[PDB]
Design an enzyme around this catalytic site. Structure first.
Site, PDB file in Angstrom:
ATOM      1  CB  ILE A 180      -9.520   2.483   1.450  1.00  0.00           C
ATOM      2  CG1 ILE A 180     -10.655   3.237   2.088  1.00  0.00           C
ATOM      3  CG2 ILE A 180      -9.647   1.003   1.798  1.00  0.00           C
ATOM      4  CD1 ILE A 180     -11.997   2.998   1.432  1.00  0.00           C
ATOM      5  CB  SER A 184     -23.088  -8.117  -2.184  1.00  0.00           C
ATOM      6  OG  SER A 184     -23.395  -9.470  -2.503  1.00  0.00           O
ATOM      7  CG  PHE A 229     -20.845 -27.532  -7.778  1.00  0.00           C
ATOM      8  CD1 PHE A 229     -19.864 -28.448  -7.408  1.00  0.00           C
ATOM      9  CD2 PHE A 229     -20.435 -26.268  -8.206  1.00  0.00           C
ATOM     10  CE1 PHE A 229     -18.509 -28.145  -7.529  1.00  0.00           C
ATOM     11  CE2 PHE A 229     -19.084 -25.962  -8.334  1.00  0.00           C
ATOM     12  CZ  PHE A 229     -18.124 -26.898  -7.995  1.00  0.00           C
ATOM     13  CB  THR A 267     -24.583 -12.328  -0.909  1.00  0.00           C
ATOM     14  OG1 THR A 267     -23.641 -11.342  -0.461  1.00  0.00           O
ATOM     15  CG2 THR A 267     -24.177 -12.847  -2.280  1.00  0.00           C
ATOM     16  CE1 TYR A 270     -17.901  -8.883  -0.950  1.00  0.00           C
ATOM     17  CE2 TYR A 270     -19.836 -10.218  -1.441  1.00  0.00           C
ATOM     18  CZ  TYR A 270     -19.059  -9.094  -1.670  1.00  0.00           C
ATOM     19  OH  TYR A 270     -19.447  -8.182  -2.616  1.00  0.00           O
ATOM     20  CG  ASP A 313     -24.689 -24.053  -4.146  1.00  0.00           C
ATOM     21  OD1 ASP A 313     -24.120 -23.188  -3.433  1.00  0.00           O
ATOM     22  OD2 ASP A 313     -24.219 -24.526  -5.215  1.00  0.00           O
ATOM     23  CE  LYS A 341     -20.233  -5.082  -0.519  1.00  0.00           C
ATOM     24  NZ  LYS A 341     -19.216  -4.272  -1.237  1.00  0.00           N
TER      25      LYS A 341
HETATM   26  N1  LIG Z   1     -17.392  -9.250  -8.352  1.00  0.00           N
HETATM   27  C1  LIG Z   1     -18.524  -9.583  -7.740  1.00  0.00           C
HETATM   28  O1  LIG Z   1     -18.997 -10.721  -7.821  1.00  0.00           O
HETATM   29  C2  LIG Z   1     -19.258  -8.564  -6.920  1.00  0.00           C
HETATM   30  C3  LIG Z   1     -20.607  -8.795  -6.624  1.00  0.00           C
HETATM   31  C4  LIG Z   1     -21.294  -7.895  -5.819  1.00  0.00           C
HETATM   32  C5  LIG Z   1     -20.613  -6.786  -5.343  1.00  0.00           C
HETATM   33  N2  LIG Z   1     -19.288  -6.562  -5.637  1.00  0.00           N
HETATM   34  C6  LIG Z   1     -18.610  -5.394  -5.054  1.00  0.00           C
HETATM   35  O2  LIG Z   1     -17.897  -4.659  -6.054  1.00  0.00           O
HETATM   36  C7  LIG Z   1     -16.670  -4.163  -5.445  1.00  0.00           C
HETATM   37  C8  LIG Z   1     -15.487  -4.917  -5.989  1.00  0.00           C
HETATM   38  O3  LIG Z   1     -15.496  -4.769  -7.360  1.00  0.00           O
HETATM   39  P1  LIG Z   1     -15.001  -5.902  -8.394  1.00  0.00           P
HETATM   40  O4  LIG Z   1     -15.922  -7.056  -8.467  1.00  0.00           O
HETATM   41  O5  LIG Z   1     -14.755  -5.065  -9.606  1.00  0.00           O
HETATM   42  O6  LIG Z   1     -13.617  -6.473  -7.782  1.00  0.00           O
HETATM   43  P2  LIG Z   1     -12.107  -6.071  -8.055  1.00  0.00           P
HETATM   44  O7  LIG Z   1     -11.236  -6.837  -7.101  1.00  0.00           O
HETATM   45  O8  LIG Z   1     -11.810  -6.172  -9.521  1.00  0.00           O
HETATM   46  O9  LIG Z   1     -12.156  -4.521  -7.691  1.00  0.00           O
HETATM   47  C9  LIG Z   1     -11.892  -4.062  -6.353  1.00  0.00           C
HETATM   48  C10 LIG Z   1     -10.699  -3.145  -6.455  1.00  0.00           C
HETATM   49  O10 LIG Z   1     -10.416  -2.648  -5.122  1.00  0.00           O
HETATM   50  C11 LIG Z   1      -9.024  -2.570  -4.964  1.00  0.00           C
HETATM   51  N3  LIG Z   1      -8.747  -2.604  -3.530  1.00  0.00           N
HETATM   52  C12 LIG Z   1      -8.867  -3.699  -2.707  1.00  0.00           C
HETATM   53  N4  LIG Z   1      -8.537  -3.425  -1.468  1.00  0.00           N
HETATM   54  C13 LIG Z   1      -8.184  -2.095  -1.469  1.00  0.00           C
HETATM   55  C14 LIG Z   1      -7.696  -1.253  -0.459  1.00  0.00           C
HETATM   56  N5  LIG Z   1      -7.501  -1.655   0.808  1.00  0.00           N
HETATM   57  N6  LIG Z   1      -7.405   0.013  -0.805  1.00  0.00           N
HETATM   58  C15 LIG Z   1      -7.572   0.403  -2.073  1.00  0.00           C
HETATM   59  N7  LIG Z   1      -7.966  -0.320  -3.122  1.00  0.00           N
HETATM   60  C16 LIG Z   1      -8.288  -1.575  -2.746  1.00  0.00           C
HETATM   61  C17 LIG Z   1      -8.495  -3.776  -5.726  1.00  0.00           C
HETATM   62  O11 LIG Z   1      -7.115  -3.686  -6.023  1.00  0.00           O
HETATM   63  C18 LIG Z   1      -9.387  -3.770  -6.973  1.00  0.00           C
HETATM   64  O12 LIG Z   1      -8.781  -3.042  -8.042  1.00  0.00           O
HETATM   65  C19 LIG Z   1     -16.756  -4.482  -3.951  1.00  0.00           C
HETATM   66  O13 LIG Z   1     -17.405  -3.413  -3.296  1.00  0.00           O
HETATM   67  C20 LIG Z   1     -17.541  -5.787  -4.026  1.00  0.00           C
HETATM   68  O14 LIG Z   1     -18.021  -6.072  -2.734  1.00  0.00           O
HETATM   69  C21 LIG Z   1     -18.585  -7.432  -6.459  1.00  0.00           C
HETATM   70  C1  LIG Z   2     -16.555 -23.811 -10.349  1.00  0.00           C
HETATM   71  C2  LIG Z   2     -17.291 -23.589 -11.646  1.00  0.00           C
HETATM   72  N1  LIG Z   2     -18.544 -24.329 -11.680  1.00  0.00           N
HETATM   73  C3  LIG Z   2     -19.689 -23.808 -11.249  1.00  0.00           C
HETATM   74  O1  LIG Z   2     -19.779 -22.672 -10.771  1.00  0.00           O
HETATM   75  N2  LIG Z   2     -20.755 -24.687 -11.321  1.00  0.00           N
HETATM   76  C4  LIG Z   2     -22.021 -24.493 -10.806  1.00  0.00           C
HETATM   77  C5  LIG Z   2     -22.577 -23.325 -10.255  1.00  0.00           C
HETATM   78  C6  LIG Z   2     -23.802 -23.680  -9.870  1.00  0.00           C
HETATM   79  C7  LIG Z   2     -24.916 -22.967  -9.214  1.00  0.00           C
HETATM   80  O2  LIG Z   2     -24.000 -24.995 -10.112  1.00  0.00           O
HETATM   81  N3  LIG Z   2     -22.843 -25.501 -10.725  1.00  0.00           N
END
Ligand SMILES: NC(=O)c1ccc[n+]([C@@H]2O[C@H](COP(=O)([O-])OP(=O)(O)OC[C@H]3O[C@@H](n4cnc5c(N)ncnc54)[C@H](O)[C@@H]3O)[C@@H](O)[C@H]2O)c1
Ligand SMILES: CCNC(=O)Nc1cc(C)on1
Ligand SMILES: NC(=O)c1ccc[n+]([C@@H]2O[C@H](COP(=O)([O-])OP(=O)(O)OC[C@H]3O[C@@H](n4cnc5c(N)ncnc54)[C@H](O)[C@@H]3O)[C@@H](O)[C@H]2O)c1
Ligand SMILES: CCNC(=O)Nc1cc(C)on1
Ligand SMILES: [Cl-]
Lengths: 343, 343
Positions: B66, B131, B225, B133, B156, B302, B160
């Site tokens: 991208i 997210s 933790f 977050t 991160y 945390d 977002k």
């Molecule tokens: N996993 C989580 O904890 C979580 C939580 C909240 C939001 N999100 C959001 O979800 C999305 C990521 O999804 P995921 O959790 O399935 O992670 P993931 O890493 O499995 O999926 C992201 C995908 O994007 C691809 N990618 C990365 N950089 C790229 C680039 N420059 N060009 C093209 N492709 C690229 C990666 O190869 C991967 O396949 C993001 O927008 C992330 O911010 C994830």
């Molecule tokens: C690294 C794996 N362990 C955890 O994530 N433990 C946690 C997470 C929270 C919250 O408290 N303990």
């Protein structure tokens, strides 16, 4: 033999800072894409051609776009930079609202690419030309460096805040980095020669260029956005810093980097705000001309007063603004009168 | 006919969303650079090859970055997209602290370029995978869409939040845009087939992969933790959504775009948080295995509890998460047992 890169160095604040760099004995290399600078009869931007004449020293210049990764890579291989002062960006608040993607592209992607190439080449010394708009609407006054940042109300302001945060995070992750973020409000005035200054295209968006254009006859009347604010005279109180003082502050920041300071943030300003009417009056005195104005509605998002506390810079940068309101006005007027159409 | 671009569609949430798109009768085109996904024995990522098998339908795929403007330009000329679901990015919270510039480059520059090419081709329908977050540390619970955003400290999170703000500003400037920003916490579980799921990650964002690995005997004990939080059992309470429910939420968002909704923001989640000990217990039940743990000190920064209110999404997307903690654990465990090393 080590050089200072100045991005956007052909512009208003840039050109003044290039002059200050040259006078202080540094070796600048400027890049600019001429987005908001006038081309001269030779290779140099007109501003920088005049800077050469004013200083008797040469400015090394390359026309390029900071969005061009290959040009940046080549630049960093070609020159050995000890630091970078970063002015290249878009800065019109009203345009930012209309064209946010352009602001985020140039300001964010541009800065990220600059930081990446700097990192790659071990140039880890940056002066970032920030904006006191990052403080958002004032919660107390004067604004100091402890005041909250964020909650800006336009894309321009947000872009500046986002860049600050990226730089802060970079420095957190790598303690070898040194970066000084300079926050200020409205640069005003011009080099005392009257040979360079701010050269707006079309109808000026900032107060002072508009007022000078009224004085010179190019505009009929100044629009004053509101006169019912909680201020002494009712008009908005704003923070104006002489561009030469501002430029000298960028030099002080450059020197601060040598102390291996890490990430530092300083306001630059006089510490005193002025109302719209106070600026009009000062420009009338400087110009000897009547400056008609018309009170219109408040502009969306404007507050009564915003001005910055420059004490920290005074203490840690060894920097103070020397030039006051009358000098700002006199120097603006000289530029305007000597250069009725700008460059 | 008109297709749906899924950026990062080879990844964990992306691949599940591709399957949901196919089941709902849409035509997906995926781009991915394989930064964090596994290549299959043919042209497709292994995830998407298995999605084809699961659905009996084909997925179009282009390997590209991208960050590559020219590749994006070509892509948008090649296909006619009605909408884009944007997952491509870096997403490891811990990694972001160590490598902020990479997070800002991929997430910010990548998104800006995507938005620019979308605008250039008149594709003005976006689901952004955000997210929760962005809310930062909870000021009240559960977190709803009125809660303050920004004040994230990790890069991160900031990245977002910055993207959300750019999208909001784009939509403010152009009312023809429709965008849905989806905020959620930790995806877990896997498609019920056990044939796709999350590959082993370098720096997981949640405990579930670790708990699965302890149960399978790849790890000795879970580190907990803190166990003296202001929570029912003393361990931290966190927000987990089944990836299939999450994927279905992205479909609901896609449908909402047809309503010409403008910019809309919805939390996705179950509406109830789960403690560390509740997850351990649930994984013991699902796995039939003992999951030893060790209480260690609290991690700096945390909080006791953080979870999202999904009521708005029920009201305006018609969407609810149906799968609870036990199902998350059973589905994770099946994926783990069928595919001990992922793809
Ligand atoms: N996993 C989580 O904890 C979580 C939580 C909240 C939001 N999100 C959001 O979800 C999305 C990521 O999804 P995921 O959790 O399935 O992670 P993931 O890493 O499995 O999926 C992201 C995908 O994007 C691809 N990618 C990365 N950089 C790229 C680039 N420059 N060009 C093209 N492709 C690229 C990666 O190869 C991967 O396949 C993001 O927008 C992330 O911010 C994830
Ligand atoms: C690294 C794996 N362990 C955890 O994530 N433990 C946690 C997470 C929270 C919250 O408290 N303990
Ligand atoms: N003027 C103000 O009121 C003000 C206030 C606070 C901060 N700043 C900051 O100062 C800088 C702008 O300085 P200015 O006021 O002298 O404006 P300016 O427009 O006169 O100068 C900026 C220069 O950057 C150049 N430039 C723009 N985009 C570029 C690109 N992609 N590649 C290379 N060069 C590019 C422009 O051509 C111009 O010469 C920005 O960082 C702006 O945010 C300005
Ligand atoms: C250039 C147009 N005029 C103004 O800038 N007028 C202002 C500025 C503020 C503040 O209030 N009126
Ligand atoms: Cl020197």
């Amino acid at each position: 033999a080590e050089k200072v890169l100045v991005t956007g160095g052909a512009g208003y604040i840039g050109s003044h800072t290039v002059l200050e760099l040259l006078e202080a004995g540094y070796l600048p290399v400027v890049i600019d894409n001429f987005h908001n600078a006038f081309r001269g009869g030779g290779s140099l931007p007109e501003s920088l051609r005049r800077v050469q004449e004013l200083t008797g020293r040469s400015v090394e210049f390359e026309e390029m776009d900071i969005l061009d990764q290959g040009a940046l890579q080549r630049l960093f291989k070609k020159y050995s930079f000890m630091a970078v002062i970063h002015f290249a960006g878009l800065k019109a608040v009203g345009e930012s609202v209309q064209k946010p993607l352009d602001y985020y592209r140039v300001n964010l992607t541009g800065t990220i690419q600059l930081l990446e190439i700097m990192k790659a080449h071990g140039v880890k010394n940056l002066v970032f030309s920030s904006s006191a708009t990052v403080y958002g609407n004032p919660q107390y006054l004067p604004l100091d460096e402890a005041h909250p940042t964020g909650g800006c109300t336009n894309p321009y302001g947000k872009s500046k805040f986002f860049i600050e945060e990226m730089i802060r995070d970079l420095c957190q992750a790598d303690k070898t980095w040194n970066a000084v973020l300079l926050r200020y409000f409205n640069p005003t005035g011009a080099h005392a020669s009257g040979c360079i200054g701010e050269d707006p295209q079309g109808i000026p968006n900032n107060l002072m260029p508009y007022v000078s254009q009224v004085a010179i006859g190019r505009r009929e009347a100044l629009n004053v956005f509101g006169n019912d604010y909680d201020t002494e005279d009712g008009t908005g109180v704003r923070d104006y810093i002489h561009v030469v003082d501002l430029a000298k502050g960028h030099i002080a920041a450059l020197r601060k980097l040598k102390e291996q300071c890490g990430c530092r943030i300083y306001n630059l300003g006089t510490g005193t705000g002025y109302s719209v009417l106070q600026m009009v009056q000062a420009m009338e005195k400087a110009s000897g001309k009547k400056i008609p104005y018309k009170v219109v509605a408040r502009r969306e998002g404007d507050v009564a007063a915003c001005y910055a506390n420059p004490s920290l810079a005074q203490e840690e940068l060894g920097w103070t603004a020397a030039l006051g309101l009358d000098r700002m006005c006199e120097d603006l007027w000289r530029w305007q009168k000597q250069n009725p159409s700008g460059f």
